[PDB]
Amino acid sequence: RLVKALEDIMVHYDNTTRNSLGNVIQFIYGEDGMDAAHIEKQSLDTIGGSDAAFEKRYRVDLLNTDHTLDPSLLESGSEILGDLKLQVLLDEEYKQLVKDRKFLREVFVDGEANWPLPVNIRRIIQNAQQTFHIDHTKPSDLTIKDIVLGVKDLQENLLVLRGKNEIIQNAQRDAVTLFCCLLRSRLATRRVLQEYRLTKQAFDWVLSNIEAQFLRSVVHPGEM
Amino acid sequence: KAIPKDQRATTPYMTKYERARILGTRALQISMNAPVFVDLEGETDPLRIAMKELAEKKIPLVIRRYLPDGSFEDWSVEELIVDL
Amino acid sequence: YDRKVPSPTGEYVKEPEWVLETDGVNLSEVMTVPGIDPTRIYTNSFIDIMEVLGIEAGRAALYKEVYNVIASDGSYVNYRHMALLVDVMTTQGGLTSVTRHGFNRSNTGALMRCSFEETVEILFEAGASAELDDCRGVSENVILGQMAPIGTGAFDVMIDEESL
Amino acid sequence: IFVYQNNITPSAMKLVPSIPPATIETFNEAALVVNITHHELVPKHIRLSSDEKRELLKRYRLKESQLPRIQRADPVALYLGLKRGEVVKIIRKSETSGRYASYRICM
Amino acid sequence: VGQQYSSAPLRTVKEVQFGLFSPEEVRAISVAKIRFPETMDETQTRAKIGGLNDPRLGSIDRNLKCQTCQEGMNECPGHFGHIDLAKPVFHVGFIAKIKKVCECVCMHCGKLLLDEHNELMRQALAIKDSKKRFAAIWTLCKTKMVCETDVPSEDDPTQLVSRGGCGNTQPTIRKDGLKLVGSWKKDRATGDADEPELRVLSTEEILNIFKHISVKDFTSLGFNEVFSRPEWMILTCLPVPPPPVRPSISFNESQRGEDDLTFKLADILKANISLETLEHNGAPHHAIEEAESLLQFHVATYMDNDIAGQPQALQKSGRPVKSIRARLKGKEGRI
Amino acid sequence: GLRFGEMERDCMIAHGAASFLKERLMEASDAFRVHICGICGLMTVIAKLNHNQFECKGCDNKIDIYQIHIPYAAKLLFQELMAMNITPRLYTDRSRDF
């Protein structure tokens, strides 16, 4: 009976899910445009633990001897201390991380952090670190503009919809919202330098892989 | 009702269904002694040759993608990016 | 019941709360009783939820119900599958069942699998109402000797006068 | 909007539709003691201007019959005072994407 | 297929629009007219007659000739025939519908028994299921039994509102085989208006009442102004399927042979003619009626064998039969 | 077992394997070639292939005409519907006059 009720529902080229009549059932398949065989359970960190922990983890205050990036994690570490213009970039990144946390805590009122999403970021990073034999001893040659502006640019490339009008572009921003929250928390500046230790080379490799895998995760029109 | 080469909002990427049908159409032709467009570095199995033609973007085929409303877009096998 | 809640420091903590479980349903009237949290009241009767809270709330509930029936055996099913089912049952504003409502249809074609030894009648009415067959099904297209506009056939292929 | 206590007379009820276009709505006090829109399972419905409606129907390129539907008497439509033909944008949280918007047209 | 050429662009069916064949179209496309209920031998001289199996329809004898379409018994897609009916007749498959439509519309002017003035009718009218809406309107209308002239407005019941003027009483229609019977009365048990009246509703009356139903009215019903007008459920011009449908078993040479459908067609044709030969020669009323219902019996059985009898009188004394619906019972059941 | 029924078909549909479904579900019946009016979806087209003349009277058609291949069992089923006063309009365009 279930088969009979859904048999005619297919994904069209507009990413819409419709029945034989042409009626819209889902304005975008699965509310995210993704193919289920390309989704994996991942942990949305931004959502868990105490705020102190949230701040210790993501907060970068170039204007504070204590809450700055130690000059050993970064090559240009010393000359970054007290940099007003960069600190403006780093505050944009933090306000966004704090919004994300609020947002997530509303969607998953529970507090649950592991949810199936496409592109396994942790795996991509474990690859980079092995591929470029990244030594956890020397400071990275990544710029703060490299990371912040880099992660910001990538987000404009994770495409599910392409329409050039206003409606579609909003639909596009919506569909990619949850994934982008995972993204921003995985590629926050302190994380990239303190935890992962990516070099400019490994990092640029990580960004293009995430885009490749993501696009490879979108559902194909014609899916029954 | 056709859409200009510009303004196509459909995927730049080839779908697994298109790849399956193109390879099958092309293979059928090769199975009937139709002219091949690549160098058979030893191949003899049609589908296997078709796959070779695809990789070298030498399949003169076009895909007509219809939209639920009736309009449609045209993408050449050449254009389509193949990553699956 | 234990309840995961944000503590003042930020981390989630368990905060037990008394809850009332009943035998019988009257959502509209209990919902209004003083002393409760009308914001969180619930019932496994997604039909009453629809009539009191609307179809969108009806949908959400129907998903919660289907989902429980699958979690009860520890089984897991990706969200989209149950979601698609729940949207179809909800698209027309009401809760449309799936366990065969119509004696003729659901979404077919006056050509697909001739049901009832009197297909004749299925065609007689299609004629009397000017039924328009979309021809997207598999059987209709089999009767027509064509391939269905699905998956591998949801687009056409053509020769290209471009290739040099 | 006419709020009453126990009920109205079937006679008077037929007195409602009688002054076009000005519409008249009725509510039984009881059905208002609690605001359903404040409920957990109820996502935000937002009435679209007929202008936003054309843009909607245009970009997705749909007939009006191809949109999901919402009953004229749906508790939420009654709340918003929806009129046959009007469209509501429904913005809900999603475990899949962050937010997902759907649309329903009043029948 | 068929190794020949046609400058006609090859394509695939994308949509199938169902509907009813109107008498006009059945003629517009027909090739022959079909009179003589016999075939082959015009004073012995075998061949074919301008009555059946030839006037234009597909051919036999390996003769390419076939309306200039040439080709042969393998490339020629049988051409359809024409055949006027002396009197109009119900199409077996719609008697049920025909009755219900009569219980919805007034049997004197064709005005729906319930307007947009009635509240329970508005709800029904809003439904989008040509199947369910019809059902809702019918259950609401079969109640009314007097084409009202004045109805209470959306205001004071004190004030009335006018509508199509035709106060006449409605009949309760019951079905008897292939005929519809109506009973009249000026209310139930009221003084000087007791007892009923039973007159059989003639096909001609039904036909004209339907022809007086407005586009809006029959469309609020499941009917379509272009593909399916109510009036067309009633037969006037019957289509004659070409030879490919109704074959002819010819064993080489000098032997009879024509399919059962052709036979049945003959009787329809015969009965149709014996009916006309009761007007050109004048005749009693009850006589022209028996003749009518005779035609009706064949046009009905020609398509469906499931009524009062099983007409199996076709060159066979053993008495065997076949029909179109039946033909599909092995073409709807074999597919 | 050994059959290929409804459940088996649903699986092939899910895989999106359309031609396989076509290959496996199509019967023996010959692929017959018919002509059709583009105005009325009927098989009332007179074809004189040597003279290149196509006419669908009742419609005044000679240019707006097409050709299609369909199993002969279909041609019959359709002509049989025409015999019962029912019209099975075959159209080449999905986009109606809408």
Ligand SMILES: [Zn+2]
């Ligand atoms: Zn011919």
Ligand SMILES: [Zn+2]
């Ligand atoms: Zn009247």
Ligand SMILES: [Zn+2]
């Ligand atoms: Zn025509």
